[PDB]
Design a protein around this ligand. Structure first.
Ligand SMILES: COC(=O)c1ccc(O)cc1
Ligand SMILES: [Cl-]
Ligand SMILES: [Zn+2]
Lengths: 21, 28
């Protein structure tokens, strides 16, 4: 999930927080 | 684009963002 979205396009800190515990 | 090389950057990004909350990283 994080692969396709944060590798093909640049993910913000806001988008990356969705993958935290 | 290489996902394994990219994966190396995301785990560092997640470390910074998640801090103390941690995270689970499953490459598959
Ligand atoms: C240290 O920041 C990164 O390496 C990074 C890589 C991919 C992203 O989608 C976002 C940040
Ligand atoms: Cl790279
Ligand atoms: Zn690199």
């Amino acid at each position: 999930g994080i692969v396709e979205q944060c590798c093909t396009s640049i993910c913000s800190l806001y988008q990356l927080e969705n993958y935290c515990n | 684009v290489n996902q394994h090389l990219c994966g190396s950057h995301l785990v560092e990004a997640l470390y910074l963002v998640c801090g103390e909350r941690g995270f689970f990283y499953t490459p598959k």
